[PDB]
């Protein structure tokens, strides 16, 4: 009951190193070796030669850990975060489908079934590392949708969407523990109704492709709900269930999501590339989604399996 060991508490940083499962390079030697790179206090498993929690000594500086980290780590698949323990465990998840969720682009998918897969892959790489705005690229890639039939939709979801490995765990296991989950996209509601469900969602928020009630006309629902629609849902989200953004956790790829990444407490770039990884404060390259629940802290025990 120490009021100084309690602001101890909240200056207090905790270093977790996350590898991937299917690649689970983190071996007990090597959690060993980084935790003495940093005299940390302690080394806590959160998931055999998968992810450790490291608790820094006070006084460290963040971004001299992480550096400490990455140095004895040089190499390996092996990510690296830096946080305050209090408070890690958050309460919202907001998530980008595209590329994050799942492991494709909606819209690329379609525009296959247009015989235009490459051209609009093209256009939808530039978005994504930002090289151009959301709003300009979606009306350019959905016109040439113009005319698919209804049909396609379904043959897409059926046929070439996969749900990214971890996915279903980190929904699942936040839910376990009372949290609010929520997927965004800059796609389409006929996928993220789908991905939702399948993945365990609470709700679901996206873009709307228009009909004539046969065939895609070629255009988006006004108005289209870019950057900062990602930025505004996480507001509404947080104000409903009675906490702010600093209770969330908000995850995506690409340019557009760093508004709801930037805003969360905890943001994370997933398997980004470099532009826009350079812009948010916790990356993950190596890890699957389960990496978001070693971030808060889980062990693999509290996973719902
Ligand atoms: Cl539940
Ligand atoms: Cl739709
Ligand atoms: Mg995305």
């Known amino acids: 009951g120490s009021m100084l060991l309690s602001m101890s508490q909240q200056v207090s ?41 490291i608790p ?47 492991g494709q682009e909606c819209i690329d998918e379609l525009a296959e079934e247009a015989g235009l897969r490459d051209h609009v892959a093209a256009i939808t790489a530039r978005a ?13 890639r959905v016109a040439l949708l113009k005319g698919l039939p209804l049909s396609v939709i379904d043959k897409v979801i059926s046929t070439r969407i996969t749900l990214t490995p971890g996915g279903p765990q980190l929904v699942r ?14 796609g389409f509601t006929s996928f993220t109704r789908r991905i939702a469900e399948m993945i365990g969602f609470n709700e679901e928020r996206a873009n709307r492709l228009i009909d004539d009630g046969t065939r ?12 900062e629609a990602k930025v505004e849902k996480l507001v509404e989200i947080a104000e409903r269930v009675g906490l702010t953004p600093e209770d969330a956790i908000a995850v995506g ?5 760093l508004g709801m990444i930037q805003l969360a407490g905890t943001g994370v770039a997933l398997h980004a590339k470099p532009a826009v ?3 948010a404060k916790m990356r993950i390259d190596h890890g699957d989604l389960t990496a978001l629940l070693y971030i808060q802290g889980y062990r693999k025990a509290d996973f719902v399996q």
């Open 13 to 53: 940083l905790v270093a977790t190193l996350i590898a991937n499962p299917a690649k689970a390079a983190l071996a007990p030697s090597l959690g060993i070796k980084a935790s003495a790179a940093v005299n940390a206090t302690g080394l806590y498993w959160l998931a055999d030669d998968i992810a450790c929690d």
């Open 56 to 102: 820094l000594p006070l006084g460290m500086e963040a971004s001299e850990a992480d550096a400490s980290l990455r140095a004895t780590l040089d190499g390996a698949p092996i990510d690296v975060v830096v946080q305050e323990q209090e408070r890690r465990r958050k309460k919202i998840l907001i998530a980008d489908m595209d590329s994050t969720m799942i």
């Open 128 to 140: 994504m590392n930002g090289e151009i705005a959301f709003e300009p690229a979606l009306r350019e």
């Open 173 to 186: 296991t936040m839910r376990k523990h009372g949290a609010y989950t929520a997927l965004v996209s800059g």
């Open 216 to 227: 895609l006309t070629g255009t988006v629902a006004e108005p289209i709900l870019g950057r």
């Open 253 to 257: 790829d690409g340019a557009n999501d």
């Open 277 to 279: 990884a350079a812009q």
